[PDB]
Design an enzyme around this catalytic site. Structure first.
Site, PDB file in Angstrom:
ATOM      1  N   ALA B  24      45.658  41.441  38.017  1.00 29.54           N
ATOM      2  CA  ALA B  24      46.059  40.234  37.555  1.00 29.54           C
ATOM      3  C   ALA B  24      46.140  40.021  36.003  1.00 29.54           C
ATOM      4  O   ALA B  24      47.210  39.281  35.652  1.00 29.54           O
ATOM      5  CB  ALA B  24      44.707  39.492  37.879  1.00 29.54           C
ATOM      6  N   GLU B  44      42.123  46.448  27.286  1.00 30.58           N
ATOM      7  CA  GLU B  44      42.079  47.378  28.559  1.00 30.58           C
ATOM      8  C   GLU B  44      41.292  48.695  28.029  1.00 30.58           C
ATOM      9  O   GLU B  44      41.831  49.233  26.994  1.00 30.58           O
ATOM     10  CB  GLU B  44      43.576  47.680  28.934  1.00 30.58           C
ATOM     11  CG  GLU B  44      43.391  48.644  30.060  1.00 30.58           C
ATOM     12  CD  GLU B  44      42.322  48.825  31.474  1.00 30.58           C
ATOM     13  OE1 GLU B  44      41.648  49.589  31.720  1.00 30.58           O
ATOM     14  OE2 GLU B  44      42.469  47.710  31.910  1.00 30.58           O
ATOM     15  N   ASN B 110      45.745  51.657  44.325  1.00 28.49           N
ATOM     16  CA  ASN B 110      45.653  50.984  45.826  1.00 28.49           C
ATOM     17  C   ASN B 110      46.597  51.894  46.502  1.00 28.49           C
ATOM     18  O   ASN B 110      47.366  52.874  46.135  1.00 28.49           O
ATOM     19  CB  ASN B 110      45.666  49.710  45.648  1.00 28.49           C
ATOM     20  CG  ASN B 110      47.124  49.058  45.282  1.00 28.49           C
ATOM     21  OD1 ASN B 110      47.974  49.675  45.409  1.00 28.49           O
ATOM     22  ND2 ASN B 110      47.088  47.932  44.701  1.00 28.49           N
ATOM     23  N   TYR B 111      46.697  51.534  48.015  1.00 30.85           N
ATOM     24  CA  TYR B 111      47.456  52.264  49.046  1.00 30.85           C
ATOM     25  C   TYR B 111      48.647  51.273  49.160  1.00 30.85           C
ATOM     26  O   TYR B 111      49.466  51.470  49.911  1.00 30.85           O
ATOM     27  CB  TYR B 111      46.808  52.380  50.373  1.00 30.85           C
ATOM     28  CG  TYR B 111      45.451  53.185  50.156  1.00 30.85           C
ATOM     29  CD1 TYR B 111      45.100  53.807  49.203  1.00 30.85           C
ATOM     30  CD2 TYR B 111      44.448  52.642  50.930  1.00 30.85           C
ATOM     31  CE1 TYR B 111      43.944  54.727  49.161  1.00 30.85           C
ATOM     32  CE2 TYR B 111      43.105  53.339  50.870  1.00 30.85           C
ATOM     33  CZ  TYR B 111      42.924  54.349  50.176  1.00 30.85           C
ATOM     34  OH  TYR B 111      41.781  55.172  49.977  1.00 30.85           O
ATOM     35  N   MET B 112      49.078  50.396  48.140  1.00 29.61           N
ATOM     36  CA  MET B 112      50.379  49.798  47.806  1.00 29.61           C
ATOM     37  C   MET B 112      50.647  48.777  48.791  1.00 29.61           C
ATOM     38  O   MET B 112      51.815  48.483  48.795  1.00 29.61           O
ATOM     39  CB  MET B 112      51.441  50.834  47.731  1.00 29.61           C
ATOM     40  CG  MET B 112      51.118  51.597  46.291  1.00 29.61           C
ATOM     41  SD  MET B 112      51.808  53.385  46.618  1.00 29.61           S
ATOM     42  CE  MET B 112      50.457  54.078  47.353  1.00 29.61           C
ATOM     43  N   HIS B 526      38.359  45.971  48.519  1.00 26.47           N
ATOM     44  CA  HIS B 526      38.750  44.573  48.452  1.00 26.47           C
ATOM     45  C   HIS B 526      37.302  43.781  47.885  1.00 26.47           C
ATOM     46  O   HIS B 526      37.579  42.460  47.963  1.00 26.47           O
ATOM     47  CB  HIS B 526      39.065  44.048  49.725  1.00 26.47           C
ATOM     48  CG  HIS B 526      40.276  44.768  50.377  1.00 26.47           C
ATOM     49  ND1 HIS B 526      40.731  44.704  51.459  1.00 26.47           N
ATOM     50  CD2 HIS B 526      41.115  45.730  49.595  1.00 26.47           C
ATOM     51  CE1 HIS B 526      41.783  45.268  51.944  1.00 26.47           C
ATOM     52  NE2 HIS B 526      42.065  46.117  50.751  1.00 26.47           N
ATOM     53  N   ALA B 560      40.179  39.102  41.362  1.00 30.96           N
ATOM     54  CA  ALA B 560      39.679  39.138  42.707  1.00 30.96           C
ATOM     55  C   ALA B 560      38.515  38.288  42.637  1.00 30.96           C
ATOM     56  O   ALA B 560      38.084  37.731  43.508  1.00 30.96           O
ATOM     57  CB  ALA B 560      39.579  40.391  43.150  1.00 30.96           C
ATOM     58  N   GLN B 572      46.218  42.168  46.986  1.00 28.18           N
ATOM     59  CA  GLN B 572      46.901  42.326  45.746  1.00 28.18           C
ATOM     60  C   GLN B 572      48.163  41.269  45.566  1.00 28.18           C
ATOM     61  O   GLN B 572      48.554  40.738  44.776  1.00 28.18           O
ATOM     62  CB  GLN B 572      47.690  43.814  45.525  1.00 28.18           C
ATOM     63  CG  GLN B 572      48.668  44.208  46.399  1.00 28.18           C
ATOM     64  CD  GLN B 572      49.165  45.590  45.648  1.00 28.18           C
ATOM     65  OE1 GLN B 572      49.137  45.804  44.460  1.00 28.18           O
ATOM     66  NE2 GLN B 572      50.051  46.304  46.487  1.00 28.18           N
TER      67      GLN B 572
HETATM   68  C1  LIG Z   1      41.695  52.880  46.565  1.00 29.86           C
HETATM   69  C2  LIG Z   1      41.926  51.391  46.570  1.00 29.86           C
HETATM   70  C3  LIG Z   1      43.105  51.158  47.509  1.00 29.86           C
HETATM   71  C4  LIG Z   1      43.568  49.730  47.698  1.00 29.86           C
HETATM   72  N1  LIG Z   1      44.491  49.619  48.636  1.00 29.86           N
HETATM   73  C5  LIG Z   1      45.009  48.357  48.597  1.00 29.86           C
HETATM   74  C6  LIG Z   1      46.238  47.858  49.271  1.00 29.86           C
HETATM   75  O1  LIG Z   1      46.916  49.021  49.782  1.00 29.86           O
HETATM   76  N2  LIG Z   1      46.670  46.816  49.328  1.00 29.86           N
HETATM   77  C7  LIG Z   1      46.135  45.762  48.544  1.00 29.86           C
HETATM   78  O2  LIG Z   1      46.611  44.700  48.569  1.00 29.86           O
HETATM   79  N3  LIG Z   1      45.034  46.051  47.734  1.00 29.86           N
HETATM   80  C8  LIG Z   1      44.549  47.507  47.829  1.00 29.86           C
HETATM   81  N4  LIG Z   1      43.358  47.507  47.041  1.00 29.86           N
HETATM   82  C9  LIG Z   1      42.823  46.397  46.271  1.00 29.86           C
HETATM   83  C10 LIG Z   1      43.476  45.954  45.075  1.00 29.86           C
HETATM   84  O3  LIG Z   1      44.004  46.852  44.230  1.00 29.86           O
HETATM   85  C11 LIG Z   1      42.667  45.190  43.974  1.00 29.86           C
HETATM   86  O4  LIG Z   1      41.768  44.170  44.770  1.00 29.86           O
HETATM   87  C12 LIG Z   1      43.240  44.502  42.799  1.00 29.86           C
HETATM   88  O5  LIG Z   1      43.851  45.671  41.904  1.00 29.86           O
HETATM   89  C13 LIG Z   1      42.137  43.885  42.051  1.00 29.86           C
HETATM   90  O6  LIG Z   1      42.842  43.504  40.605  1.00 29.86           O
HETATM   91  P1  LIG Z   1      42.015  42.856  39.651  1.00 29.86           P
HETATM   92  O7  LIG Z   1      42.969  42.554  38.587  1.00 29.86           O
HETATM   93  O8  LIG Z   1      41.025  41.970  40.322  1.00 29.86           O
HETATM   94  O9  LIG Z   1      41.121  43.854  39.160  1.00 29.86           O
HETATM   95  P2  LIG Z   1      41.471  45.423  38.483  1.00 29.86           P
HETATM   96  O10 LIG Z   1      43.008  45.733  38.969  1.00 29.86           O
HETATM   97  O11 LIG Z   1      40.600  46.635  38.879  1.00 29.86           O
HETATM   98  O12 LIG Z   1      41.497  45.104  36.946  1.00 29.86           O
HETATM   99  C14 LIG Z   1      40.126  45.081  36.023  1.00 29.86           C
HETATM  100  C15 LIG Z   1      40.647  45.887  34.906  1.00 29.86           C
HETATM  101  O13 LIG Z   1      39.724  45.475  33.776  1.00 29.86           O
HETATM  102  C16 LIG Z   1      39.423  46.608  33.012  1.00 29.86           C
HETATM  103  N5  LIG Z   1      38.193  46.621  32.422  1.00 29.86           N
HETATM  104  C17 LIG Z   1      37.067  46.132  32.944  1.00 29.86           C
HETATM  105  N6  LIG Z   1      35.961  45.796  32.071  1.00 29.86           N
HETATM  106  C18 LIG Z   1      36.785  45.942  30.848  1.00 29.86           C
HETATM  107  C19 LIG Z   1      36.291  45.582  29.571  1.00 29.86           C
HETATM  108  N7  LIG Z   1      34.865  45.512  29.224  1.00 29.86           N
HETATM  109  N8  LIG Z   1      36.939  45.820  28.729  1.00 29.86           N
HETATM  110  C20 LIG Z   1      38.247  46.123  28.802  1.00 29.86           C
HETATM  111  N9  LIG Z   1      38.799  46.492  30.055  1.00 29.86           N
HETATM  112  C21 LIG Z   1      37.907  46.252  31.043  1.00 29.86           C
HETATM  113  C22 LIG Z   1      39.443  47.609  34.094  1.00 29.86           C
HETATM  114  O14 LIG Z   1      39.809  49.085  33.272  1.00 29.86           O
HETATM  115  C23 LIG Z   1      40.637  47.303  34.787  1.00 29.86           C
HETATM  116  O15 LIG Z   1      41.864  47.727  34.372  1.00 29.86           O
HETATM  117  C24 LIG Z   1      43.089  48.722  46.751  1.00 29.86           C
HETATM  118  C25 LIG Z   1      41.777  49.040  45.901  1.00 29.86           C
HETATM  119  C26 LIG Z   1      41.752  50.379  45.640  1.00 29.86           C
HETATM  120  C27 LIG Z   1      40.585  50.845  44.620  1.00 29.86           C
END
Ligand SMILES: Cc1cc2nc3c(=O)[nH]c(=O)nc-3n(C[C@H](O)[C@H](O)[C@H](O)COP(=O)(O)OP(=O)(O)OC[C@H]3O[C@@H](n4cnc5c(N)ncnc54)[C@H](O)[C@@H]3O)c2cc1C
Ligand SMILES: Cc1cc2nc3c(=O)[nH]c(=O)nc-3n(C[C@H](O)[C@H](O)[C@H](O)COP(=O)(O)OP(=O)(O)OC[C@H]3O[C@@H](n4cnc5c(N)ncnc54)[C@H](O)[C@@H]3O)c2cc1C
Ligand SMILES: *[C@@H]1O[C@H](CO)[C@@H](O[C@@H]2O[C@H](CO)[C@@H](O[C@H]3O[C@H](CO)[C@@H](O)[C@H](O)[C@@H]3O)[C@H](O)[C@H]2NC(C)=O)[C@H](O)[C@H]1NC(C)=O
Ligand SMILES: *[C@@H]1O[C@H](CO)[C@@H](O[C@@H]2O[C@H](CO)[C@@H](O[C@H]3O[C@H](CO)[C@@H](O)[C@H](O)[C@@H]3O)[C@H](O)[C@H]2NC(C)=O)[C@H](O)[C@H]1NC(C)=O
Ligand SMILES: *[C@@H]1O[C@H](CO)[C@@H](O)[C@H](O)[C@H]1NC(C)=O
Ligand SMILES: *[C@@H]1O[C@H](CO)[C@@H](O)[C@H](O)[C@H]1NC(C)=O
Ligand SMILES: *[C@@H]1O[C@H](CO)[C@@H](O)[C@H](O)[C@H]1NC(C)=O
Ligand SMILES: *[C@@H]1O[C@H](CO)[C@@H](O)[C@H](O)[C@H]1NC(C)=O
Ligand SMILES: *[C@@H]1O[C@H](CO)[C@@H](O)[C@H](O)[C@H]1NC(C)=O
Ligand SMILES: *[C@@H]1O[C@H](CO)[C@@H](O)[C@H](O)[C@H]1NC(C)=O
Ligand SMILES: *[C@@H]1O[C@H](CO)[C@@H](O)[C@H](O)[C@H]1NC(C)=O
Ligand SMILES: *[C@@H]1O[C@H](CO)[C@@H](O)[C@H](O)[C@H]1NC(C)=O
Lengths: 590, 590
Positions: B24, B44, B110-112, B526, B560, B572
């Site tokens: 996001a 980040e 993630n698994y894309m 998730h 999320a 995602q």
């Molecule tokens: C192994 C795996 C497989 C998955 N497979 C799928 C799939 O196939 N399809 C699908 O739709 N979803 C999948 N998902 C889920 C999906 O990728 C996540 O739900 C989504 O990426 C979450 O995005 P977000 O922005 O909420 O968090 P994230 O993308 O986790 O972003 C949070 C970011 O903030 C940073 N951060 C945290 N705290 C701080 C701080 N204090 N200061 C600075 N930076 C900080 C972290 O380093 C990170 O980069 C998968 C997840 C994983 C782990």
């Protein structure tokens, strides 16, 4: 695939490990990988300076960021934040000593000057280390191998700023290290050429042909197309990505060299708190520079026995030269307000905006200039020699070869002052400021590096000990008076606005001049000779003529620490060349 | 100039700060920068995964690295190394919960899979948060805006692997997020299509048109030309590097959001030990994800009063929903030896070498496959429904919409086992292994996140609390029996080698099945709803329908954590879309 070049922090084996992804480090790592000796890994504590220091390391004119003596004038993305011990020659001043922490090391941080030593310096090198391959004629191909020379661009520089060069010693164009003339010459430097002639400094054809005495426009490690800094990262590492024999470990701190009997077999590494061991089948090359190469030897059990005992480090080889015989150069400069554009004009918003567009669209304007332009070299002339120097000083200087200069002058399109922080103390009252810097090429003062801990994560104790020998003191006062002679020429007068701005004429007597120098000088960042090359039978020597660490096996040092003594002027050309040479020595496939 | 995009760690002011350069985070940061709202900085903690995890995050088939439950199955270059509290539903197992620590966050890991929720899920979203812009037809353009769709390549996939898609909902080609079908389809998936039909799962036209029930080939965030992973970094951040309104602070840990009265005015940041404060003139967006968004709110004074008092954090707003109502999905899979090529073949050196050449030269072969290929979705059918579910379970499931599936099946060309470490426990005895994974789409279990410290550098306390509601327990057993129905089809029989490999038929009774699931399941990653979107007057809600944090000013949460509830399947697509939506809400320039 970019990622294919970058290592995973776990136990694994390579044929060669290079510790330090700096000037020498990335050069030897890339050349070993290309010369068919097997797998090479390079270990670097920093990251890319393009990600970790904005565009400050990419733009030549921004080279004055984070090099001041102030203890806070650094940030951890490009600098180690090292400070000196209280300095006997600088009224016990504790000063920041800038060191690159990044791929490229101090080639990310330097003022980009490319200049070689003298034939007689190379003769002394050959004699001291007992190896004639260090004489000018034998060593020269290793200087040329690295280079891609581009001639001066007269259309962008202007006719005023025509250059006198020797292209025949600047390689065949095939090397990855860009060397060229800036697309912009400081107007101040253009006037300085005439002033240098008036005080007896003849023009020569550059500083790359084994002689220095006289003046010339400097050559710089800058890309001729973009006018971006050329570091060991933008040259050697960029070629080496694309070589599947090279793996890079960045954000990786080497903690300890491991010895089985007296043979170097691996390195203990920490990447963001994850400990692992990289193993070497063949050789380990230490390229951690003048401060951290000696530190890594000592915490690994190679160094003075008494120091290693005092910090509970098991002895591998009693080598009392490790961290001893540090040599360095210093720099200071008076300044004048001048009637021409200098870097001062970048403080004006309308001027900066135009310079910004000129740089990005046409690789032109004042951003494309490393601050310097013309270097000049001399012996202090007669009759000033007899008036200014004691008998002892004249006896010591007469032991240097005829071709080896005593003083370097550098044109600078900016203000030095006390060099506490060039950005904060940059005068902002609406005048253009220029300086004529001086460096001393015959340093007699010797310094050292030691440890407070067996942890390489704790900074080493750094004691350059500049300006403590009476010869350096007398030379420092002489060099300052020569800057006054430059600024009293009729050639320079028409661009000067009022009298000397800094320090000013109130600095008059020998003792007042010395006092001002002790307050206003810093290192010019040429720390070296802490792992000195010499004869295997010399107990003070650390490496032999093949850069092998005496007393152990399969361990070399290739960086500024390995130099036998500091040759006159800017050492990066010599470190590129030394890395080229030891690469061929190791591989046998050149 | 690359460096022009990257920030210097010192006090300075931007119009907008985004905390977290994740899925996001990089999306909203890039879109805000493009939409003329002024200067945007993204913060980040990690770096580029292309430098910090080799090629493991770039190659789709390498997605199994560092996702196991074992506490050591991570490295600090791509993962936070987070572990759960002892898990009530998993026999008090303490498990590694993979989270991306890198630009791209968990989109690097993630698994894309790219799949959208259902029309009725979007209807429930609209109702819960009191905003009809979340209904399918109003939200859809935000799903389409991100995408560059490439159709299936039949020549590389083979005729066997023909796909049924709905291109009309996959955008106009202008978006930076590559979505396509892999160049390689698992032979296992090709057979699975026939087996899915035999157990009553009809083919549908993809998973992007607001319905799921049935089966289809999955769409993936993979570049159609290179078959590299498409993360938020390779898509949004790469577009944003050309935008002078975007500054990136990488290797930068946000410690605290600063409030003047109840208004968010800045962020306290640490880059490699250097503390500084970034100021926001307009708005701060928190995108630190399901674990670290609630942690940053709590250490900043927004959360349950009792928790903040217990850790000496001054109260800014008593918000008892912060870190509560965590929702998640789980996954487990039986495995068989099969008579077709699966990822197992990569353990054979001659096979790997050919696959390696196919990937790098032609973007073809098994490396170009994310392990999955076909997803399938159902309600547990009658008459199995009455036999397998209590009356209470059937009453709870009848409250879900007709279009909202109970169980997801995923083809996997690899072995799951206990999911401790997929790489170490990958069976190496010369057979090909395949699995049919199941995930549960109606989780009733709820978890939480809290703190042990006011320091964001200390990991949060993470309690997903999976498989603790009796509805999830009954669904888990039903889903496992449906995998047995799949593997007893006459369609799949011809590729099976001997009986069920894992766990094996000795797992027979309901209690044995439950016990095996409790041992062999993990999260499918998730985690969500810890800063839940709801009505401003709901005391448990954390953000309103505009993603504004209730009880304070100029602070949004977009990740999320902000979801009101977890929609069925892979989130995602929804997080990209939500970031697109809140970007337009903030800018008003779409
Ligand atoms: C192994 C795996 C497989 C998955 N497979 C799928 C799939 O196939 N399809 C699908 O739709 N979803 C999948 N998902 C889920 C999906 O990728 C996540 O739900 C989504 O990426 C979450 O995005 P977000 O922005 O909420 O968090 P994230 O993308 O986790 O972003 C949070 C970011 O903030 C940073 N951060 C945290 N705290 C701080 C701080 N204090 N200061 C600075 N930076 C900080 C972290 O380093 C990170 O980069 C998968 C997840 C994983 C782990
Ligand atoms: C401001 C400044 C201006 C200069 N100007 C010029 C000039 O114009 N011309 C010129 O010729 N010379 C100049 N120099 C000097 C010249 O650049 C240096 O002598 C040269 O860069 C040093 O090369 P090196 O390989 O010895 O060390 P470095 O380039 O400093 O390399 C050492 C590397 O090792 C790494 N390292 C150290 N310890 C560890 C460890 N334990 N684990 C992992 N990595 C480690 C460091 O991060 C660094 O990358 C200048 C120096 C500076 C600071
Ligand atoms: C992902 O990254 C791996 C590198 O970290 C890479 O493995 C390496 O592959 C190279 C080939 O490109 C191998 O190097 C080869 O070098 C000479 C060529 O002069 C060959 O004759 C040798 O046979 C040798 O194999 C490395 O051996 C290999 N290194 C490791 C760590 O195994 C993978 O190829 C990359 N994967 C993909 C799909 O690109
Ligand atoms: C070195 O890096 C600096 C930024 O990290 C960069 O300064 C930035 O320059 C941009 C212009 O490229 C300015 O952004 C401008 O954006 C809009 C265009 O839609 C203009 O209307 C605005 O006036 C605004 O100036 C940033 O303000 C500026 N950032 C800062 C902190 O000044 C330098 O330009 C880079 N140096 C070089 C030589 O390229
Ligand atoms: C890595 O190597 C070192 C020394 O060889 C050893 O102490 C450590 O146990 C090794 N780790 C593994 C996982 O083998
Ligand atoms: C200089 O930069 C240009 C453009 O990036 C590139 O094509 C060229 O290779 C560089 N030159 C050298 C000698 O590194
Ligand atoms: C050389 O040209 C520059 C720019 O045109 C000018 O500022 C400078 O004064 C000139 N020098 C001399 C010596 O005429
Ligand atoms: C370093 O030099 C100083 C000054 O010459 C000397 O007194 C000091 O002991 C030296 N340190 C070492 C460890 O050699
Ligand atoms: C996919 O990668 C290719 C080559 O790197 C590039 O030209 C293309 O723009 C990429 N597509 C997207 C939408 O990221
Ligand atoms: C589809 O074709 C591939 C050949 O690439 C083969 O391995 C696979 O078994 C085929 N599947 C079916 C069901 O025929
Ligand atoms: C940086 O910002 C913080 C926030 O108020 C404060 O400590 C101080 O004013 C600033 N420090 C510096 C070095 O400017
Ligand atoms: C979190 O969830 C558990 C139930 O698994 C509960 O017992 C605990 O009190 C909750 N903690 C907080 C801080 O809400």
């Amino acid at each position: 695939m970019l990622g294919s070049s970058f290592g995973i922090p776990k136990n694994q084996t390579f044929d060669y490990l290079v510790i330090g992804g700096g000037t020498a480090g990335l050069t030897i790592a890339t050349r070993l990988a290309e010369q068919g000796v097997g797998s090479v890994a390079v270990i670097e504590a920093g990251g890319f300076y393009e990600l970790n220091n904005g565009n400050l390391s990419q733009i030549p004119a921004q080279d004055a960021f984070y090099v001041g003596t102030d203890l806070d004038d650094w940030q951890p993305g490009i600098d180690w934040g090292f400070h000196t011990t209280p300095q006997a020659g600088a009224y016990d001043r504790v000063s920041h000593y800038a060191r690159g922490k990044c791929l490229g090391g101090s080639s990310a941080r330097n003022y980009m000057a490319y200049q070689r030593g003298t034939k007689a310096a190379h003769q002394r090198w050959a004699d001291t280390v007992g190896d004639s391959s260090y004489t000018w004629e034998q060593f020269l191909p290793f200087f040329e191998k690295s280079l891609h020379f581009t001639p001066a661009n007269d259309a962008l520089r202007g006719a005023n700023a025509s250059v006198v060069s020797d292209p025949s010693v600047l390689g065949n164009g095939d090397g990855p290290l860009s060397v060229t003339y800036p697309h912009y010459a400081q107007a101040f430097a253009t006037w300085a050429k005439h002033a240098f002639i008036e005080i007896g400094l003849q023009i020569r054809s550059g500083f790359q042909s084994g002689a220095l005495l006289g003046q010339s426009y400097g050559l710089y490690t800058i890309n001729a197309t973009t006018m971006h800094r050329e570091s060991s990262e933008t040259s050697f590492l960029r070629k080496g990505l694309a070589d599947p024999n090279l793996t890079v470990f960045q954000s990786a701190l080497a903690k300890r060299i491991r010895f089985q009997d007296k043979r170097a077999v691996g390195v203990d590494v920490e990447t963001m708190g994850r400990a692992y061991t990289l193993s070497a089948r063949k050789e380990i090359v230490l390229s951690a520079g003048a401060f951290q190469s000696p530190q890594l030897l000592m915490v690994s059990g190679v160094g003075p026995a008494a120091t290693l005992k005092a910090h509970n480090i098991p002895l591998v080889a009693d080598r009392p030269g490790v961290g001893q015989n540090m040599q360095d150069h210093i720099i200071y400069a008076p300044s004048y307000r001048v009637n021409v554009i200098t870097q001062s004009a970048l403080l004006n918003e309308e001027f900066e905006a135009q310079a910004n567009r000129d740089y990005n669209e046409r690789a032109a304007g004042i951003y494309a200039n490393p601050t310097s332009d013309i270097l000049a070299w001399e012996k202090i002339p007669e009759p000033k020699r007899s008036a200014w120097f004691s008998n002892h000083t004249r006896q010591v200087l007469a032991e240097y070869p005829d071709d080896w200069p005593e003083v370097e002058f550098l044109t600078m399109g900016g203000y030095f002052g006390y060099q506490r922080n060039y950005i904060r103390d940059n005068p902002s009252d609406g005048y253009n400021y220029a300086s004529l810097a001086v460096s001393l090429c015959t340093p007699r003062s010797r310094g050292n590096v030691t440890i407070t801990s067996p942890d390489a994560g704790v900074p080493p104790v750094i004691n350059p000990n500049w300006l403590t020998d009476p010869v350096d003191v007398e030379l420092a006062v002489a060099a300052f008076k020569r800057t006054r002679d430059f600024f009293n020429t009729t050639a320079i007068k028409p661009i000067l606005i009022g009298p000397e701005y800094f320090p000013g004429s109130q600095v008059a007597t020998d003792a007042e001049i010395l006092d001002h120098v002790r307050k206003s000088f810093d290192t010019i960042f040429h720390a070296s000779c802490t792992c000195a090359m010499g004869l295997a039978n010399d107990t003070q020597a650390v490496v032999d003529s093949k850069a092998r660490v005496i007393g152990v096996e399969a361990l070399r040092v290739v960086d500024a620490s390995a130099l036998p003594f500091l040759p006159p002027g800017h050492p990066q050309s010599t470190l590129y060349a030394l890395a080229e040479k030891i690469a061929c020595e190791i591989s046998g496939n050149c």
